[PDB]
Design a protein around this ligand. Sequence first.
Ligand SMILES: Cc1cc2nc3c(=O)[nH]c(=O)nc-3n(C[C@H](O)[C@H](O)[C@H](O)COP(=O)(O)O)c2cc1C
Ligand code: SF4
Ligand code: SF4
Ligand code: SF4
Ligand code: SF4
Ligand code: SF4
Ligand code: FES
Ligand code: FES
Lengths: 98, 212, 147, 105, 32, 221, 456, 111
Amino acid sequence: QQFSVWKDELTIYICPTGVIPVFSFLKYNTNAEFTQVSDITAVDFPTREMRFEIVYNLLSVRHNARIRVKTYADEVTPVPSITSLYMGANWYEREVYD
Amino acid sequence: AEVELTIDGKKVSIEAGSALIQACEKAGVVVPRYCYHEKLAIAGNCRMCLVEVERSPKPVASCAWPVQAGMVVKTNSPLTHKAREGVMEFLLANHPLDCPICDQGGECDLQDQSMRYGADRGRFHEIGGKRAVEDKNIGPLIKTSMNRCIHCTRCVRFMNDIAGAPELGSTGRGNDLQIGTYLEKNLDSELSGNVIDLCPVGALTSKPYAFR
Amino acid sequence: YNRNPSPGDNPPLEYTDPVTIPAGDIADNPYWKRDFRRNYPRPSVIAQAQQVALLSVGSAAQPRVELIGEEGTKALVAAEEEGKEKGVAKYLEEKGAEEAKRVLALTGGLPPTPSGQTMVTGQWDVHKYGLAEEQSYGGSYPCRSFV
Amino acid sequence: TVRIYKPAKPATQSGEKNTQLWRMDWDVLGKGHRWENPLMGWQSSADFMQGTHLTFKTKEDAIAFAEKQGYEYFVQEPNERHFRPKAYANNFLYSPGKLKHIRTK
Amino acid sequence: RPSFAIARSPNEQVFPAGAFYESILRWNPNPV
Amino acid sequence: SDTLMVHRNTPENNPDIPFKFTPENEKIIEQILKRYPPQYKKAAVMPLLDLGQRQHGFCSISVMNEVARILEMPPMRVYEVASFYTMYNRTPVGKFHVQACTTTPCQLGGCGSDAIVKAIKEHLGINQGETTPDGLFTFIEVECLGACVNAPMVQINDDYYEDLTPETIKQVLTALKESVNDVSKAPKPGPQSGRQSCENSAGLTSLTSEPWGPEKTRPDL
Amino acid sequence: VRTYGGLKDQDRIFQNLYGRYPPDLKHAKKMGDWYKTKEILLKGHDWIIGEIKASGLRGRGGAGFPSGLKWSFMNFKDWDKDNKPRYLVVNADEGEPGTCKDREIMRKDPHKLVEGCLVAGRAMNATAAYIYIRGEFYQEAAILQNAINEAYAEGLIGKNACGSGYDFDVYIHRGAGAYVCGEETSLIESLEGKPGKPRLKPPFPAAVGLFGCPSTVANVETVSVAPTICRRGGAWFASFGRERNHGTKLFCISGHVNNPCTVEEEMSIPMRELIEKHCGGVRGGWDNLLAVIPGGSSTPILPKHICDDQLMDFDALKDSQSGLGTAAVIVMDKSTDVVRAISRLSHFYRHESCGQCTPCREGSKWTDQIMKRFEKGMGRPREIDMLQELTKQVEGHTICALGEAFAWPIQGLIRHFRPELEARMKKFAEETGGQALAGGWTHDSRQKGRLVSPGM
Amino acid sequence: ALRRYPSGEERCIACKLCEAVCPAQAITIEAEERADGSRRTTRYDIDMTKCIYCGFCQESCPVDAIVESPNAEYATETREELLYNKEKLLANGDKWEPELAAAIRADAPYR
Ligand SMILES: Cc1cc2nc3c(=O)[nH]c(=O)nc-3n(C[C@H](O)[C@H](O)[C@H](O)COP(=O)(O)O)c2cc1C
Ligand code: SF4
Ligand code: SF4
Ligand code: SF4
Ligand code: SF4
Ligand code: SF4
Ligand code: FES
Ligand code: FES
């Protein structure tokens, strides 16, 4: 949907139905070898209909690069898991759910 | 009719004969103030609302400047930064180091506008010291600590214009100008406690509320 | 030698609290020329509505067409308006595949590389890990030394 | 029931940043909000919402959140300032007759 | 402590009216 | 100096001492009023305060209340005018009130007012601000009195004593001391040691010729 | 191509400056006053304003603005469509240290002023005049009130002034001691029976002034020449000074001169010839000179090296980074404590500030304490720059020009005498065995258990 | 420990700065004007089982009133013994003043 650049951090805003294809692209593309999930957290914005901002942080040790992807959910909208692409995302998503 | 000016690059309309500070609250532009109150007469005394205006050699008091046809106003320029930093230095030079013992702390315009618009450090260290003035008795309700006064004139305007109580004033001249009653007399006005809230600083505080 | 004298008998007069010349000077620093906290960068946000725009007419750096005087402004709003009416996928659909090829021309033909985070060499790059000149475990042990 | 409102400016200050947004609080109930501890005189409480508040960008957002959470909710609207031109030159206007008060600056 | 030139009697004038205030008595807004 | 800019409720200065302008002063008042627009009668507060400072002796709190009553003012508005202006002695002063200019023009011209102040202190054994034990003199330094080309100079009550040497300023005072008994011994107001008024002592270098009148005007008139 | 100065005795305005004749109306008649005032009044105000504008006359009260331009302002678009009175306020406050010219006009020739108000008032269509005398000038006011009294008696001013059909009153108002009441607006508020605290302008006296009425403040010398400007001519008066500076001037020349005096002399005269001829020259010769204040105490100091070819002129002293001011000339020898002379002025302005606004109520006391320290060298040199910054935060951030009046003299001292300020800062350091801290504290303050912030 | 001036006057003036900065809300202060018109505390409690011993409260004091002693050996039989009132804290300063002064002396220039 959009991207923002603050100082050295690049954020990518996406719709929740694209979680699998976008993270597939960021894991496997040659210019996007983002093979770790550093982190997965949420931020609550009760002023927004979709309360919850799902924020993932990725690392690319090949390119010494970091990237942030943000999507949104609410108390009833679910989000596609990325546990099929990132074994390390198992516990992060459990923390967001808890 | 509402004339049209630009403040900080944005366009604002307002009835003519308005203060330029008034056009700023309409344009969502924050301008620092001490003497100016919306409910009082304009005094022009503090010098904290100076802004840049075209075709104007010197900074203008935004509280006392009538909105003109098509003026361009800068509230964020190097001129305004330099003025707000310098006027804060003047108002804090003989101000007492009493922020711990003062009942205005945490709710002070002078510390909130000193933190936002002044330097972080004072350059005033005189061996001569600061000005000290004696306290005053103006009744059982208003505790006095007059070293704190910044000479804004808000309570004298309120007491004389709003409340019809012409006993409070400012006797003296220069750096020794002092707000109070000449004679030690009670303030007799049912609107009296309103000067406590009007007071930008804690020189005029509440006796029942003191230190609690 | 160790902890002698104790810090509780170190003379107070000896230590001097340090002030730097510009920040701590009394006559060569307004606060506002060092107020770097209030000069904080804003996030720069690009949406699909004005990525189509940047593709339509270029940028203040690399403009596409001249946009000379008036009658260019009406084209300027259309580039933004066409972005808000149709997005990037639709934009590449009607311009065809060579617009998509010009997208790669924005980065010289290949896709851009993501930016590295070191700048130890003067430019933001990947840190070049190399094998250290001296290997502490020699070759005897399975731990190798890198710089 | 919760209260949805824009906090009014404090009487003691001229800054208006705490008036910018909409705040949602929980009303004090008759019992259990505060009572004094027998030991130290500290103030005890049984109201688990007493120290919490939410902030919203618009009034509609506050209503939508309270409707979706199942809160009872009351809205008060902010009292707006009545505009009036202020002129420094009013301080010195001519009076053809009796001076109704003596201005003191 | 010391003495002063302070009015002892209500009707007496401690400091003279001066030449200026006398010239306000010879004043007249009309021709002679 | 130590002139408090609030009121001290002394037994010679409290709101209980009655004040009333003398009938001779009452005639002076109505002259003052006729010079101002009728509804702005408060514009006479300074003339009345001065007129009350000369009848009573000093600007006591009762004289300010009296003036505030005559001019239909809140007395605070009169307390402000009195305290702002320096020619209002809100404390009693001596029979003579020595004012010596000590600003830069009077600190350099002539002897330079340092010996003039020294002479005053030497003659009266008093310091700046205090008054003599017999109440004849009050002494202060002041700012430019508007007679700089004639420095060192002093104002005693209403007369200027210009062009002073530390010797002459001593005899100006001792003349004032003896002048209370016999008026014939009052000092001559003005400058001392020759010069008449702001002249050049070593002869007049200007306006020595016969002056002109209406002689040179064009036919257009 | 021509030198300015040495004007003839038959070319002066204030002939009786040196007390040739008693100030009675009879002698003023021989002076050429009240001569053809009938014609002057019956000529329209436009004709009077044109004659004033042609004269090049600029205000003589320390600002030098075109007085013909100024008095036109009060003839605003519909000045005849209001029932309110119009006022001429003549500034006779005589405040600037060094200045004593207007007390001589008021005693020696009050009628040059009493008639001057009529022509000044007529040009501006005013209904009356108020003259504000500093109360310390008591005989100056009694004499001048006698002239007004005699002017009413013979029908010169009053109901039918000079038989011209113009109605004009003239009143004295005496002050009670305040240099700030010499300010434009401070004069007006004091006349309304208020503390002489100046007013902010956008409201301008030409619109709202005394009593909220149309008003104009003008100096005594400004008004005391205007009738002569008409009876002699705009071209006559515009015959002196430089291209943009015209006419004569009074010059109260005090200080370290061997013969202090006031003198009327041509504007744009070189200062040295003004000093060395009318006043007998610098005391102990010209070489003994160190510095001059070319205006009153409100103009920056000028060292000996620039005084040599300085024209006593409105524009010329400006190029020296100074002003003509009130044309008071205080000269100083090489035996002067110049910082003491300047610091005394910084003390004068601390006592003569009204206290209404933050920059001058706090800055006139702050600058005084710095100057009192700088005399005795209790400070470090980088404070001289700190005092320079302080004066520039006052300079254009105030209700009135008194903020400039106490900042300018300090700045000019920094501009030409910093090594003197530096020399005695160095001396005090060796005297106390250490460089002084900021604020005047000694180097060992922390050693003797004082409270010294980092960087003091 | 709460400390006193060389005259025995309490140094505490009830500004409440330490109550505000506390990260664990262990300080509860109630103040009034004292009989002689002095700004003094009426209540001064530290919950010693809520405290985190960070020193932020002594960092913020304008007058060096609240300090943390060099004492670590004060273990108690009950938790009520760990609820310090003003009476217990002044008594601590009255007993420990010689070290509190020697610690401030040795550490003041770095603050
Ligand atoms: C602090 C201060 C003091 C002044 N004192 C006098 C004074 O004593 N006499 C005077 O004629 N002008 C004085 N002025 C200048 C007046 O404000 C005003 O310019 C002048 O009286 C009338 O203008 P004109 O001289 O251009 O006619 C003073 C100005 C200031 C700021
Ligand atoms: S009024 Fe002064 S002393 Fe009181 S809190 Fe504000 S800055 Fe501190
Ligand atoms: S007491 Fe308060 S309101 Fe009154 S002048 Fe002083 S600071 Fe202003
Ligand atoms: S500059 Fe300000 S403080 Fe100084 S006299 Fe003018 S108004 Fe008063
Ligand atoms: S911060 Fe210190 S002085 Fe202030 S209330 Fe707390 S203990 Fe007392
Ligand atoms: S040291 Fe203890 S009492 Fe002080 S602020 Fe930290 S937790 Fe609170
Ligand atoms: S707010 Fe305009 S000067 Fe005080
Ligand atoms: S300086 Fe003393 S009269 Fe001018």
